Amino acid sequence: KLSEQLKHCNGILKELLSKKHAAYAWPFYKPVDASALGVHDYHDIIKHPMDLSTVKRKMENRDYRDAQEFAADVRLMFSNCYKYNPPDHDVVAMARKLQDVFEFRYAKMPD
Ligand SMILES: COC(=O)[C@H](C)[C@@H]1N=C(c2ccc(Cl)cc2)c2ccc(OC)cc2-n2c(C)nnc21
Ligand SMILES: C[C@H](O)COC[C@H](C)O
Ligand SMILES: [Cl-]
């Protein structure tokens, strides 16, 4: 049984995965497939891949012991995107928008 704070985190996660945000969330649904995408330098540049399916698995498996650990993974996901891609690329604009959704709701965390 998740703590109250981790319940809030799980709610955020469900929201990020919902159809409401799909237009900009979809690149983050699954691990980057570097070979499929032709980005053969991705794993040289990104040492700690992260994506929402992995966050979801970790939540289901009770891997996260607190909200801070959850938030660090979601933010790592966005950071990888900002690290690999030029700041004016489409996928970066999507990341910024999804991160806005995440940060404003994470800020509503019950004490
Ligand atoms: C050539 O650069 C790319 O393809 C990067 C690696 C890729 N761009 C994208 C990307 C490029 C253009 C648009 Cl409009 C949306 C996403 C990408 C696409 C699919 C995907 O999972 C299936 C992950 C993507 N992703 C993420 C997350 N962070 N960077 C990307
Ligand atoms: C767009 C920045 O990379 C992240 O900003 C988060 C803010 C809550 O929109
Ligand atoms: Cl953090």
Q: From the CA of 31, which ligand is nearest?
A: 1
Q: Which atom of ligand 1 is nearest to the CA of 95?
A: 27
Q: Report the separation in Å between the CA atom of 4 and the middle of ligand 1, taken as the mean of its atom positions.
A: 34
CB 29 within 8 A of CB 51: yes
In the chain, the domains with their CATH numbers are 1-111 (1.20.920.10)
**Is residue 44 helix, strand or coil?**
helix
Long-range contacts of 86-94 (CB under 8 A, 24+ apart): 91/27, 93/24, 94/24, 94/25, 94/27, 94/28
What resolution in angstrom units was achieved for this structure?
A: 1.6
- Nearest Cα neighbor of 77 from 100, 105, 99, 109 is 99
